[PDB]
Design a protein around this ligand. Sequence first.
Ligand SMILES: Cc1cc2nc3c(=O)[nH]c(=O)nc-3n(C[C@H](O)[C@H](O)[C@H](O)COP(=O)(O)OP(=O)(O)OC[C@H]3O[C@@H](n4cnc5c(N)ncnc54)[C@H](O)[C@@H]3O)c2cc1C
Ligand SMILES: Cc1cc2nc3c(=O)[nH]c(=O)nc-3n(C[C@H](O)[C@H](O)[C@H](O)COP(=O)(O)OP(=O)(O)OC[C@H]3O[C@@H](n4cnc5c(N)ncnc54)[C@H](O)[C@@H]3O)c2cc1C
Lengths: 554, 554
Amino acid sequence: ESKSFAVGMFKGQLTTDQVFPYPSVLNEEQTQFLKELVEPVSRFFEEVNDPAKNDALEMVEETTWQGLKELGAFGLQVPSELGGVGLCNTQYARLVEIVGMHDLGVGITLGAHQSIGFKGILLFGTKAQKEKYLPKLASGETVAAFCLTEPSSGSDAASIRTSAVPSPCGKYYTLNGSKLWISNGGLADIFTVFAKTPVTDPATGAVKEKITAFVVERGFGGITHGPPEKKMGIKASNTAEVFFDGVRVPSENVLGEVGSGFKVAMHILNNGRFGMAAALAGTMRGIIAKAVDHATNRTQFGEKIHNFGLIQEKLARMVMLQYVTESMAYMVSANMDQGATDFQIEAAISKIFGSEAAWKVTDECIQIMGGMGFMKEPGVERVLRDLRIFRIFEGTNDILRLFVALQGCMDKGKELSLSLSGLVHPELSRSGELAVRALEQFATVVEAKLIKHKKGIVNEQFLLQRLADGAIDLYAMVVVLSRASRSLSEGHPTAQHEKMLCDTWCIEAAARIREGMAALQSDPWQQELYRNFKSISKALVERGGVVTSNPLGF
Amino acid sequence: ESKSFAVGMFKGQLTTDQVFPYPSVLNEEQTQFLKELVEPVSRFFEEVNDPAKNDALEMVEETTWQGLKELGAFGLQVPSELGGVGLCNTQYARLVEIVGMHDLGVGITLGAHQSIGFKGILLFGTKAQKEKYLPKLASGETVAAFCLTEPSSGSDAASIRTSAVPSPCGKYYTLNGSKLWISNGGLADIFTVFAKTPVTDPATGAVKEKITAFVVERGFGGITHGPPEKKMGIKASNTAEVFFDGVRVPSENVLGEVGSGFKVAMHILNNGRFGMAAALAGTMRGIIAKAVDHATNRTQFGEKIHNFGLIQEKLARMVMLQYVTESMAYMVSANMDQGATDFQIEAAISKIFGSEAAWKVTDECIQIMGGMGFMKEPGVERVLRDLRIFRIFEGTNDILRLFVALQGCMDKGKELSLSLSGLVHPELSRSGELAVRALEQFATVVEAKLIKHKKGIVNEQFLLQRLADGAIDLYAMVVVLSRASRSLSEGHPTAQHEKMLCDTWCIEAAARIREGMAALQSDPWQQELYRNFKSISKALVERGGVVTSNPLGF
Ligand SMILES: Cc1cc2nc3c(=O)[nH]c(=O)nc-3n(C[C@H](O)[C@H](O)[C@H](O)COP(=O)(O)OP(=O)(O)OC[C@H]3O[C@@H](n4cnc5c(N)ncnc54)[C@H](O)[C@@H]3O)c2cc1C
Ligand SMILES: Cc1cc2nc3c(=O)[nH]c(=O)nc-3n(C[C@H](O)[C@H](O)[C@H](O)COP(=O)(O)OP(=O)(O)OC[C@H]3O[C@@H](n4cnc5c(N)ncnc54)[C@H](O)[C@@H]3O)c2cc1C
C-alpha cells in the first residue's frame, strides 16, 4: 500500500505517514555542518554576486562564477569522497533557498548543472561512471547540461528524434540530432543526452525504437552549440541549441539500461523537482521583505500605507503563499531523505504551487510599490521577469496538472477496475476537520468521474485541470496543518502566528474545494461551459484569431 | 435622476439609457472619414514603426516620430479649425486600438501628449488659450505632458507640494517644485502643471491653499528635467522628473478657475480613461492572433495543440476578456459622444477590467507558446512587460476599486440618509435574468452594508474591494448582453458567436457575484478572514518581513 498522502486522498483515504508529524531529518552533526555553510553562502550572495549586473551582462560575472566553483556550489549533493559537499536533500534545499532569494539566473545555471544536468549519474551511474565524472562535475571544472528538448518535442519527451545507432562491434553508438533551449548548452562539457536507439527484446529479439540516456563528453567530437538565446529573464543563465553530428559515444556511456532512457529522464526531473519550490520559497521571502519595507515607510493619504486594509490583505496573502510553498518544499525533501519511493504527485504539486505563488507574490509586490515597482532600479521587475519561465520549464504547469490528476486517478481506477484527531494539534482541530471534509468531497467526485468516464477520463481535460486544483489545495492544507501542529506541539515562538496562517489558508482552501467539487458534480451549467469553451476555440482557430470585429464593424 | 447604469445598480435600479441599445454614434460621413484614416494608420504601424526597435533603443525611432507628426497622430481630437484631425471619442477609440495592437510604448507617448498632457486645454481652455496652444500641440511641434505626480504624492493628488504664489501686481505666478515619473517630461514644451496656490474666498476673503492647474511653457524659464528613467516596459516612452525653479507663469495661463485644479486633474483623467480600454482591446486582439497561430500549428502528442481542452479553455477565456474589454471601451466612448455627464464609475471599471484582462490574456499567450513565449524574438514578453504599468498609472487599480465602490455607494447613502425583457434580445433572455438577479443580490448587500457601517464604510477596505469586483462583473454582464443583443437584432454575421461569448461570460460572472455577495452577507468566517488579514500584516510589519523561519529554524 502506498505511503503517499496524495495517492490515498484520490481514494478517499487518509494516508499520513509522509505528512504527520512534520518531518525532521537532520542529525545534530548535519545541522551544525549546514549552519557553517549557510553563513558563507549568504555572505557570498550579499557581497560578491550582483544579480542586476548578471542580468545586464546576460551572463554570470567571472569573479562570481569562479567564486561559486571555490565555494563548492557546483557539487552540493555529490558525496565528499567523490569531491562534493555531500549534502542530503534537506540541506540542499536550505542552500537552494539562499540562491532563490538572491539570484534566479545563477540558480538556473547551478540547478541545470546539478539538479538535472549530471543528476542521472548520481541516480543511475555505475561505480566506474561516478568515479570518472563526479569529481570534475562537483568542482565545476566540467559544467553539465540536461539535453532532452528538441524543436519538435517539449512536453512530449517520447516524440524526440535525436538518434543513437549502435556500431557492429557494439563498442560505441553514433549520435545524431539537435537539442533546443538547453540550459548551459554553450558552457557544458558533460551532457546527459536522450536519444532513440534500437532495443532488442530479451525473449524474441524483436527490435523496437526506445529512448536511451547517455553521458556525452564535448571532447568526443562532432558537438557544437548555438549562440546564447535572448529571453525575458534568467538572462544570466546560458541557454543554447546543442548540435550532435556523427558523435561517437562509448557503449559504456549508456546511463541506466538501454531503452529505459524515458524512465531515466522522468526520474531525474522528479528527483530535482523539490529544488524549485525550495528556491522560490527564498525568492518570496526576499520579495516580501521588500513589499513590507515599502508599506512600512510610504505615507499616502496621511498614513503609512500598511494601515490600509487593501495593503494588509495583499501582505497577508503573500506570506501565506510563501509559507505553504516553503512547507511543501521541505516536506518533499524530507520524504526523499527518509527513503520515500512515492512522492511524485506531491513533488509536481509543489512545483505548480511554488512557481505560481512566487509569480503572484512578486506581481503584488510591484502593485504595493506603485510606480516604483515598475522601475528597473528597485530590482523587483527583474525578479518578475526571471519568474515567468518557472511555470513552463521542468514540466509546464498545464502538463503537471494533467499528471497530478491522472496519476492520482490511477490507483482508484485500478480498484474500481476519517479523522485527523490525534495528528493535528488540538488548537487546529477545526481546520483539520475542514481538510477531512474537503478530502471526502474530493474523493466522491473522483470516484463518480472515473465510473462515468473510465479510461476516457484522459481526454476530459477541463475536468482534469479542476481535479488537479482540488488536489493542490488539499495537499496545501495538510502541509500547513502538519507544520503548524508541530510548531504548536513544540511551543515554538512563532506557533500562534503559524496557527493563524494555517487557519486563514484552510478556510479559503476548503471553500475552493467545496465550490470546485460542486461545480464538477452537481452543476447543470458546467457542461454548457465545457461545450462553449470547445466551440469558441474552434471558431477562433477557423478564423485565425478574434472572430468579432470591433462594434463599428471595420 | 442619474442616467448612469452603475449609479442605478448600487441602488438596486435598472437604469439602461446609457447601456441599451448598444450605442451607435457615427453619422455616415464620420464613418467614411474614419475608414480612410484606419488604412494609413494601420499601414504606418505595419510598415514604418518597429516596436522591438523602439523598446531596444528606449525611445521612438526618429523616422517613426516624424512620421506620426505628419500623420496627424499628435492631434487626433483637436478640431480641424485648430489644426487637428477633429475626431470624436468613438473615432479616437478606433485609431487608439490600432496603436494598442502594435506598440504600447508609442501609445503611452501619444496618449500622455493628448489624452492627458494638453487635454485640459481642450476641456477647460478659454478661446485665447485654445487658439494660442492647440495648433502646435496638434502638429506635435510642441509635445505636452501632464504634471501631477510628485515624490510625496501619487494616489493622493490633494497632498502635492509644488507651489504657485501670485505676484503683488497679479500679472503672474511664481512656480516652484518638482514632478516625478512624468511621461514626455524630457520631451515636452507644454506642461499641464498642478500646484498649490492661495485661494481667496469670495464672501469672507479668507485665504486657503487649494490646487490650481496651469499651462506652462518650457520657454518661461527655470524648467529642467532629469534623465530618462529605466523601467520594465513601455521603454520607448520618455519618463522623467521635471523641475520648476522660480518659474514665472502669466496669470492668464491659469487653466480653469483658481483653486479648482483638483477637479481639473480629475476631469482630465476621467475624460481620458476610456482610451486605455480601447488601446488594450487592440493589444489583446493582436495577442490572441499570436496564441491562435501558435496553437493552430504546434504538434505535440500527435495532434495540433488546439485539439486539447486545456488550450481550448485558455483561448476561449482570452477572447471573452477581449470582447468584454472592447465592448466597455466603445460603450463609454459612445456615452461621452452622446453627451453623458455621469460615466465616471463605468470609465473606472473599464480601466480596471481592461488592464487586468490584457495582463491575463498576454500571460496565457506566453503559457500557450511554452518555452518560446519566454524568448525575446516572438515579441510577446515585450508586450507583457509593457502591460504591467497599466494596472498602476492613471489611477492604481486598488484606488480605482475604492472609487467605484464608494462612488457607487454615495447616492444610495444619500437616500438612506425588475426585468431586462424587451431590452435584451429574446435569445439572451436567460442571461438577462442572470444579470437582473445578480443586480438584486448586489444591491441587497450594498444596502445592508451602508446601514451597518454608515460613513465608516470608507474604512472597510476588504469589503469595498469585494463590492467593486461585484460592480465590475455586473457592468461586464450588461455590456455584453447589450452588444450581443444588438448583433442578434441586426442579424450580424457574428451574432450567434457573440451570443455564445455573452452566455459563457454571464454564467461565470453571475456565479462570482452570487458567491461573492454570499461571502459578504451570510458567511460567518468572512469576519475571521478580515481580522486575520490585519493581524498577519501587523505581524509582518513588526518583523520587517516573513515572521517564520524555514522549518529548520535557521
Ligand atoms: C530558458 C529555458 C530553459 C530551458 N532549459 C532546458 C534544459 O536545460 N533542458 C531541456 O531539455 N529543455 C530545456 N528547456 C525546455 C523546456 O522545458 C520546454 O520549453 C518545456 O518543456 C515546454 O515545451 P515546449 O516549449 O516545446 O511547449 P509544448 O510542449 O509544445 O507545449 C505548448 C503548450 O501546449 C500545452 N500542451 C502540450 N501538450 C498538451 C496536452 N497533451 N494537453 C494540454 N496541453 C498541452 C503546454 O502546456 C503548453 O502550454 C528550456 C526552456 C526554456 C525556454
Ligand atoms: C512609467 C510611468 C509613467 C507615469 N507618467 C505620469 C505622468 O505622465 N503624469 C503624472 O502625473 N504621473 C505619472 N506617473 C505616476 C503614476 O500615475 C503613479 O505612480 C500612480 O498614480 C501611483 O502613485 P505612487 O506610485 O506614488 O503609489 P502610491 O500612491 O504611494 O500607492 C502605493 C500603493 O498603496 C496603495 N494605496 C495608496 N493609497 C491607498 C489607500 N488609501 N488605501 C488602500 N491602498 C492605497 C496604492 O494602490 C499602491 O498599491 C507615471 C508613473 C509611471 C511609473
